[PDB]
Symmetry: C4
Subunit: 252 residues, 4 copies
């Protein structure tokens, strides 16, 4: 099936960005203040997004983001039947990409806090895979950051893949989206490796539930796990209206 | 109206660079010496300029700078009626981009100096949005830096958008201008996140006047606020003569 | 002979990446914690790979990696007679590139530990040219990192040079492969400047055996020298199956 | 005259790279260990070379290097009458670019050592404009670094501007040469902001002789001033033979 081929490309693409992105967070977290800080995490996530789009772009268009897929279906650019398949294909691959990172750092992760896995705290390793609320990442503060960050990502994506504009060459899309992701982490959020991808957050978080961290990965932070899912979905809706009201509606 | 469509693209483009640029300054300023220094500020401003040009380039040409627009009208490449509309459209968006950054860091900004907003000093947050004169950024020292930095930016822009040369592809313009902005901050000025854009300085400064910082944002530093406006305008005139005398006049 | 011209391009290309890559490691190792850390090493190796592909790409395709050449012959894209010649041509050039770095830092290297060459330890200089097992780079831990890193490199290379996709422009291949190498070092491995190139590891290691470090460069670490050779070769096989099962087989 | 137009482009191009390059060295040197280190100096010099080629490339080909011009005339690609005019045009502009940096940092430079200009030492500012021999930059050690660095630069330039290869697009040349310069500083030399351009070294050094530093800028270091001139010229000869023997001679 043609739609099965595109789902496989989205699965591999989201595997690349999660495996590369979570591996750099594991390097910083496990080697406390020795192998870089936030700059190397931001560049790795931005570079991984560029690489993942180049690999999977020629098949499925390389959305690699349920929020981006939701925005495409909202504008009727893609059928609504692509939304559940892409979301499932993107979540699977973030789950698999998290497993590869777990295998890479299996001994270092288990030795971070003796011989047990801790979700949050000073000796906490669950934050390598999924985001957890810090002092300045409360429910209200975190919701606003993910809403604005996803709206900015949607506007930049729509401005590059616009049919009414000149057909962009290959590579330009990959390096543009990797540029937005790099600058969103640098600017938005006091502490956020990546908070604009619902699949990049739920997939690895679901892996840690079964990897041995327990069910505390969902109940911690007053059930914060649904914030990195709903807020980027709302932010993609806001980013569509901004692009249409500023640029899109006048291109007719 | 056709000229209304171009004004909307300039408004959104200047919103992107101010929101991304001021967000990275807020990260460094609020988290004192923890989330990077001047290198991350310079890269973010350079990357934001590249992103803003890519988004708004296909409509208005993505000047995103009143000095660049003034240089274009000086060379009779654009009508003089575009200068006031673009300047107003660029200033609005730097005003809106500053408001988004204020919302993102609302609790952190208010808690930097207790429960009040301070313009300048050790616990000063008004420098996140607009430039203020430091020890080595006096009136004479600051004027020379903005004059030279804007002259260098104009020459590089004119050399890329030159009709007499080969038609440059899309993306080349965006990455070239983002390269100039990145290297101007690294080289020119002992301390300057961005000092080559009059709209990027006056817009956010006007926001802080009404946001709660008071009217001290204009009277501080012996009324320094007009320097980041007049000096880049004069520097753009100087950059036009340099390009014409070196390259432009001999392309006939 | 046509196949002799391609071997000469592979020899020069592998010389560039080893000479540039090992020179940056020598800067960090000899100047202990003064001239950068792991970020500058990673960028230099990534930039050197981009430069080496641009120089040698137009002649031999710029594999510059026996694992990449092995993957190409496995997919029957190149004849099996190219594998031994390219591997010999890639190993010679890593040997010569290591000699140039030895000449550049001849006095600094000899003065690192008095007036003698030490393979491993605190005053050890043999790690400039070849990788040696650290605390978290044991046989099992090291084998897994090189297997995964080479599988990721193969998938990205196959997705760019795919005949069934659109013909990529020049430069896109060079910057893509340099991006994978940069992000592999940042993410995979707790400490690895480059561990995805068998020629980049054996060539410089063979040079140190004759340069004066002795035969200890092979017997150290329970004979670790064969791990950076066999594991990337197996990883390239794994990367071929992943690409074929996800993307390649459905492009017919 | 046609050859006068090309000389003016070379003058402006070398002005850009010296003004941007020396400004970043002044930031690091004057603000001791506060505004970055060697990484920001290397990126600025690499980015300035990319910018200078883009501005002046369409007119004169943007050699911006007497060693590159000498290599072009050696291969009979350009007439020998271009060598003295380009060298004079490149040296003038490095002289002017140094004057702009002197004006930018006039008060900071004079206050580095009280109220006098010192060539070398702890409070020395002449090293902002020209290279001076450090502990590991002796005559023999320095000569080898500049010879190898210029040979590597020539090979990369010849591989990109080769007529026998596919015609490279604009921008690819500028970003390639800026990549070589960035990685030469990172790898070659224990301490070298840029040591592959004879005009970038003699021009600013001649400015400091008349700016107030005195004639000590030539007699210091056992008359080291001629090393950054002769050695890159010899290195360009070596880089031509390497490229011809590896790639060039077999492209017929």
């Amino acid at each position: 099936y043609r739609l099965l081929r595109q789902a496989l490309a989205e699965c591999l693409g989201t595997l690349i960005l999660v495996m590369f992105g979570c591996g750099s967070v594991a390097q910083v977290v496990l080697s406390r203040g020795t192998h870089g800080g936030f700059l190397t995490i931001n560049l790795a996530f931005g570079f991984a997004v560029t690489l993942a789009i180049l690999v999977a772009g020629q098949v499925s268009g390389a959305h690699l983001n349920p929020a981006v897929t939701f925005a495409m279906c909202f504008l009727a650019r893609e059928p609504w039947i692509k939304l559940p398949i892409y979301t499932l294909a993107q979540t699977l691959g973030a789950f698999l990409g998290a497993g590869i990172v777990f295998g890479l750092y299996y001994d270092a992760i288990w030795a971070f806090a003796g011989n047990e896995l801790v979700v949050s705290g000073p000796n906490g390793t669950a934050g390598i895979f999924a985001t957890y609320p810090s002092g300045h990442l409360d429910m209200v503060n975190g919701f606003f950051d993910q809403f604005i960050g996803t709206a900015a990502l949607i506007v930049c994506v729509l401005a590059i893949v616009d049919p009414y504009n000149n057909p962009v060459p290959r590579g330009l899309e990959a390096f543009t989206v990797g540029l937005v992701v790099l600058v969103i982490g640098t600017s938005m959020g006091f502490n956020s490796g990546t908070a604009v991808n619902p699949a990049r957050d739920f997939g690895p978080r679901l892996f840690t539930a079964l990897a041995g961290w327990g069910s505390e990965v969902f109940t911690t932070g007053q059930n914060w796990w649904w914030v990195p899912i709903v807020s980027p979905l709302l932010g993609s809706i806001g980013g569509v209206f901004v692009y249409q009201l500023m640029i899109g509606c006048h291109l007719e």
